[PDB]
Design a protein around this ligand. Structure first.
Ligand SMILES: *[C@@H]1O[C@H](CO)[C@@H](O[C@@H]2O[C@H](CO)[C@@H](O[C@@H]3O[C@H](CO)[C@@H](O)[C@H](O)[C@@H]3O)[C@H](O)[C@H]2NC(C)=O)[C@H](O)[C@H]1NC(C)=O
Ligand SMILES: *[C@@H]1O[C@H](CO)[C@@H](O[C@@H]2O[C@H](CO)[C@@H](O)[C@H](O)[C@H]2NC(C)=O)[C@H](O)[C@H]1NC(C)=O
Ligand SMILES: *[C@@H]1O[C@H](CO)[C@@H](O[C@@H]2O[C@H](CO)[C@@H](O)[C@H](O)[C@H]2NC(C)=O)[C@H](O)[C@H]1NC(C)=O
Ligand SMILES: *[C@@H]1O[C@H](CO)[C@@H](O)[C@H](O)[C@H]1NC(C)=O
Ligand SMILES: *[C@@H]1O[C@H](CO)[C@@H](O)[C@H](O)[C@H]1NC(C)=O
Ligand SMILES: *[C@@H]1O[C@H](CO)[C@@H](O)[C@H](O)[C@H]1NC(C)=O
Ligand SMILES: *[C@@H]1O[C@H](CO)[C@@H](O)[C@H](O)[C@H]1NC(C)=O
Ligand SMILES: *[C@@H]1O[C@H](CO)[C@@H](O)[C@H](O)[C@H]1NC(C)=O
Ligand SMILES: *[C@@H]1O[C@H](CO)[C@@H](O)[C@H](O)[C@H]1NC(C)=O
Lengths: 168, 207, 317
């Protein structure tokens, strides 16, 4: 909680990488909010960082089969919020992380999705890199073509909204 | 039959309409729940204040609540108006598919689902339409040696339809959607260009 | 947006007064969440159109064509193609206003894009509608011409000219985009408009709307409690109106963007994963092919058509 010669607000200070004019005791950003302040008893320019905050979301299996859950705390450290996965998408607490690529089940963000595989087996939450499917590096040649022989008749579904509640 | 099993075992498949009706019902129910907000008034109920407060104070608080209730209605209408634009767009798409795939068999690419449209069928639904989209998708294929033309008497003989193919011993003509090879004859090919033009041209007798 | 923070966080009295408006901002927090969800849905509708990710062949037999200018370059620190790089280098807090990361990152978009491009060049429509078929670029070209009623001899007679016209046009696209930044306005305006609407929302927090002070947490520490309540009610209402204004604009802009994404997804199917004859649909002329490219907040398609050049007047019947 700060007050530097009447300049007030909240946040975290660190050393800046910029210089101010002798008449500039503070700086402001794009929306004129405090960017940095100078210490009146030790002039030094110190950048102001917002106090850690972010949204909190929960990754859960359906409760009909299991109750292991893990929680994502956005834009913060795993120490600010046991099995902790640090990511900008939010530190996932109550989960592990694996380097290998897999399909997407429950999204974390920034390329990582959680899934629920078991281990020796107990079920747990593991954060994984998204694969986008098998990498089908098909080779081609100017003298060869894959030509269909027989076919399948596939029938799928699509459902579209047509109308809303006729509110009066 | 697979579709029926999918729809009954996976009710979440019906989410396109179920979420819409729940969102609209919730928006309207929210509009009702917000009748209880006081907006700075002693009470959220207009007909409570009028028989409870000294009339000039009641008048001020009543007007505050009228404004609050109005804002709730304005919010609702704007949200329903924006949603209506999305629903109209969806309805327009549904109408488009019903003309193009149901009363037709559109070649628009994967428009009504992956594959060539063979047919489509609508079903009714509360607040919407369900379509069964039927397509043609290759089941099996095989790698054949191919050519755009064959070389015969110094000229390039092109298939009238399809590509020239081979299993390693004989050349024939097939279509890209089905390997049903034809004998190469003057009834199945045409002649243009020459043997020094076609890339991939192979030497094959034309009957 | 955290509306508690935007209106006045870390204050017992601001919270108690904010709650007198019920769900007025709760529904906005929900509307913004819904928009963010839609933005990932739009991205998936536009780019995840391959059954599985496909990759290009180890041997770049492009028939003399340079698709290296369109496909992401794996040797660079940023795996972007020369066109994508030009675009990506040009298209660009404590108050509760933040931005969430995408699920599908630029690199993964480039990976789906690469698969789509791989098909565009050597398998056409088959990366979509069924098992992939092996359709090598020179044959796919013979087919691109047959698809518009043109005998494939034009491909062979002009194989070098056809590749050179494509390659030249790519160079022209790169020269245009690199010198005319306004050409990227379709995405630059999206980022600037949304950033400005939000930055305006921040600037507007300082309006007093007739209040004694523009700051809610200033009034509660400055005015006698009932006087403070009156001044606080006026500022909360003004701040709530700013949040609603922002969200309404974002919902409308989302509708325009969703429509754009749906059109983009349609073009991918019509000119990338096929060669549609809908007139001038994915650019003027008969479609031959189209190559998707990634972009911040968008998709770029390189539209390739057959367009008559020189013509003559001949006696007819
Ligand atoms: C306001 O007055 C204070 C008086 O405390 C000033 O602080 C003093 O700053 C001088 C210059 O740096 C310090 O002298 C030297 O400090 C260095 C490292 O701090 C040390 O290695 C030397 O041996 C020598 O002592 C002095 O210690 C420091 N006094 C403190 C910290 O109590 C301050 O600079 C003035 N600020 C302004 C804006 O005028
Ligand atoms: C595709 O474009 C690249 C980029 O211009 C070409 O790479 C150039 O190759 C020439 C000679 O082959 C060199 O003199 C240049 O220095 C290369 N440019 C760069 C930036 O490295 C490449 O040759 C083109 N490929 C084809 C098949 O045309
Ligand atoms: C069609 O236009 C093309 C343009 O690519 C012509 O190709 C050029 O022909 C001129 C002289 O005939 C040469 O000087 C150029 O070097 C050619 N360009 C390229 C890229 O090779 C082509 O001749 C024209 N074809 C017809 C039938 O008129
Ligand atoms: C966690 O803190 C480290 C330094 O302690 C910092 O580099 C990193 O940005 C933080 N992570 C997040 C998501 O804020
Ligand atoms: C298609 O042919 C394959 C063999 O190539 C066969 O195994 C399969 O049963 C056939 N599919 C249908 C639907 O008949
Ligand atoms: C095919 O016939 C042509 C004559 O037009 C000849 O030049 C060429 O060598 C032949 N190709 C073979 C035998 O593979
Ligand atoms: C190729 O097919 C032709 C007739 O379709 C037949 O005469 C020949 O035996 C086949 N070759 C092989 C290797 O199967
Ligand atoms: C196919 O292209 C390769 C190199 O890309 C070349 O070696 C080969 O001769 C070509 N084959 C035909 C039939 O054109
Ligand atoms: C064909 O005739 C039209 C009509 O007069 C004329 O404008 C055009 O120049 C002619 N084109 C050629 C190639 O002579």
């Amino acid at each position: 909680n700060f007050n530097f010669n009447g300049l007030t607000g909240t946040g975290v200070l660190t050393e800046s990488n910029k210089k101010f004019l002798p008449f500039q005791q503070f700086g402001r950003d794009i929306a004129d909010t405090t960017d940095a302040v100078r210490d009146p008893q030790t002039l030094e320019i110190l950048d102001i960082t917002p106090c850690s905050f972010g949204g909190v979301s929960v990754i859960t299996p359906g409760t009909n089969t299991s109750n292991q859950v893990a929680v994502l705390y956005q834009d913060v450290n795993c120490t600010e919020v046991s099995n902790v996965f640090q990511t900008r998408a939010g530190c996932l607490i109550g989960a592990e992380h694996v380097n290998n690529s897999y399909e997407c089940d429950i999204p974390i963000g920034a390329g990582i999705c959680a899934s629920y595989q078991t281990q020796t087996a107990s079920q747990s939450i593991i954060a994984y890199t998204m694969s986008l499917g098998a990498e089908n590096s098909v080779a081609y040649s100017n003298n060869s073509i894959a030509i269909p022989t027989n076919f399948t008749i596939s029938v799928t579904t699509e459902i579209l909204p047509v109308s809303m509640t006729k509110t009066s | 039959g697979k579709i029926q099993d999918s729809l009954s075992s996976t009710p979440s498949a019906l989410g396109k309409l179920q979420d819409v009706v729940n969102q609209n019902a919730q928006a309207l129910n929210t509009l009702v729940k917000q009748l209880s907000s006081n907006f700075g008034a002693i009470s959220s109920v207009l007909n409570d204040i009028l028989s409870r407060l000294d009339p000039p104070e009641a008048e001020v608080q009543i007007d505050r609540l009228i404004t609050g209730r109005l804002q709730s209605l304005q919010t609702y209408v704007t949200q329903q108006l924006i949603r209506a634009a999305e629903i109209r767009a969806s309805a327009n798409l549904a109408a488009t598919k019903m003309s193009e795939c149901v009363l037709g068999q559109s070649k628009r690419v994967d428009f009504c689902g992956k594959g060539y449209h063979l047919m489509s069928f609508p079903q009714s639904a509360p607040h919407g339409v369900v379509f069964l989209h039927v397509t043609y998708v290759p089941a099996q294929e095989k790698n054949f040696t191919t050519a755009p033309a064959i070389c015969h008497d110094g000229k390039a003989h092109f298939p009238r339809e399809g590509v020239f193919v081979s299993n390693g011993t004989h050349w024939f003509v097939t279509q890209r959607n089905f390997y049903e090879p034809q004998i190469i004859t003057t009834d199945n090919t045409f002649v243009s260009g020459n043997c020094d033009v076609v890339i991939g041209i192979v030497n094959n007798t034309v009957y | 947006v955290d509306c508690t923070m935007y209106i006045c966080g870390d204050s017992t009295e601001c919270s108690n007064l904010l709650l007198q408006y019920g769900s007025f901002c709760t529904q906005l927090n929900r509307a913004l969440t819904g928009i963010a969800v839609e933005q990932d849905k739009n991205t998936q509708e536009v780019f995840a159109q391959v059954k599985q990710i496909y990759k290009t062949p180890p041997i770049k037999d492009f028939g003399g064509f340079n698709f290296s200018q369109i496909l992401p370059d794996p040797s660079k620190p940023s795996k972007r193609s020369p066109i994508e790089d030009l675009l990506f280098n040009k298209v660009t807090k404590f108050n509760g206003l933040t931005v969430l990361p995408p699920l599908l990152t630029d690199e993964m978009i480039a990976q789906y894009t690469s698969a789509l491009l791989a098909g565009t060049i050597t398998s056409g429509w088959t990366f979509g509608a069924g098992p992939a078929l092996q359709i090598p670029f020179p044959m796919q070209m013979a087919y691109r011409f047959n698809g518009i009623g043109v005998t494939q001899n034009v491909l062979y007679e002009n194989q070098k000219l056809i590749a050179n016209q494509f390659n030249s046009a790519i160079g022209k696209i790169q020269d245009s985009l690199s010198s005319t930044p306004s050409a990227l306005g379709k995405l630059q305006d999206v980022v600037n408009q949304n950033a400005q609407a939000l930055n305006t929302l921040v600037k507007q927090l300082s309006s007093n709307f007739g209040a004694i002070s523009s700051v809610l947490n200033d009034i509660l520490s400055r005015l006698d409690p009932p006087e403070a309540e009156v001044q606080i009610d006026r500022l909360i209402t003004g701040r709530l109106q700013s949040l609603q204004t922002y969200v309404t604009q974002q919902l409308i802009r989302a509708a325009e963007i969703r429509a754009s994404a749906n059109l983009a997804a349609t073009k991918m199917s019509e000119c990338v994963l096929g060669q549609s004859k809908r007139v001038d649909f994915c650019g003027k002329g008969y479609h031959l092919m189209s190559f998707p490219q990634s972009a911040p907040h968008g998709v770029v398609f390189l539209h390739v058509t057959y367009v008559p050049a020189q013509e003559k007047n001949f006696t007819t019947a």
